[PDB]
Structure formats: structure tokens, C-alpha cells
Symmetry: C3
Subunit: 58 residues, 3 copies
């Protein structure tokens, strides 16, 4: 059914996908753990290695 993944308030994330060196974002933070991060960028929810993500506390 329809649902919404509420982001972790007061955080924004810049990230890189796979091997592309371009920074993407800012994006929302959904989860962090196991040396990885879950981000939501518009309608796309992606898993990114922690060192491929810059987390910023607004």
C-alpha cells in the first residue's frame, strides 16, 4: 500500500553512486548502519557506503 518513509530530521546527505565521482544531493537521511547509509533523493531511495556519503547536521 501507499506509505511514506519519514526522514531523520535535521540531517541532509551528499552522496556518490557506484563509481561515478560526481557528488549528488542534498538528500534526506533514512537510515545509517553497517558502514552504509540509506538516502532518499526525490522518489529514489538508495543504499550508499558510508565513505561515499557526507552527512550534514542542519
Amino acid at each position: 500500500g501507499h506509505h511514506h518513509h519519514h526522514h531523520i530530521q535535521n540531517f541532509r546527505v551528499y552522496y556518490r553512486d557506484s563509481r561515478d565521482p560526481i557528488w549528488k544531493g542534498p538528500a534526506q537521511l533514512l537510515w545509517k548502519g553497517e558502514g552504509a547509509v540509506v538516502i532518499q533523493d526525490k522518489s529514489d531511495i538508495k543504499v550508499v557506503p558510508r565513505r561515499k556519503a557526507k552527512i550534514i547536521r542542519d
Copy 2:
């Protein structure tokens, strides 16, 4: 696309949201991390720190 996050069977979760002292729930458990849990309450999927969550075995 359209999808459903199936809850972890035989568990319910009461949780505290943001700055409201009243407990919400019972909600579904989607994921149990070491420091936080992912819950689903109706169409809302939220990340709650373990200290603000009460996992019930039913």
C-alpha cells in the same frame, strides 16, 4: 513502483514520536537495529531510537 513492507511477524511496537511524551501504537516492526528501530504506523514508516521504543512479543 508499488510495494509493501511486510512487518516482522509476532511483534508489535509502542513508540514515542519527537517531543510528545505520550506513547503511540501499537505499530508494526519493520527492522530492529542495534541503536534504532524502523516501525510502520498506518501509512507512516518511522525510525525510532531504541530508548523511545517498546517492542512487544505477541
Copy 3:
């Protein structure tokens, strides 16, 4: 809102649904935690204990 959970590239997962002994899949891998994995099988996103999942790097 509408969104898509992008899978972790180059992984295929076979799994069992709790009691049912029949193997299901191939499914996409969304998250590999400690003790469990999150998989997507068409419209269903499920949490599977690690012992009940076979992750294949292809």
C-alpha cells in the same frame, strides 16, 4: 509518496518464508544487516534471517 527502493547491484537472493520449506526467488537485495537481510521480490519487501537466505554475487 511514490518511491522506488534501488537494489544493491550484482546480487541475487534466494530465501524462505519462515515455516514454508520451499525456496523463493530470485529476489533483489536491499540491505544486508547483522543477522538478517532485506529483500524485494516483485511488490513484496521482506526481512529474512541470514540463515534463511542465500546471497549470490552475479
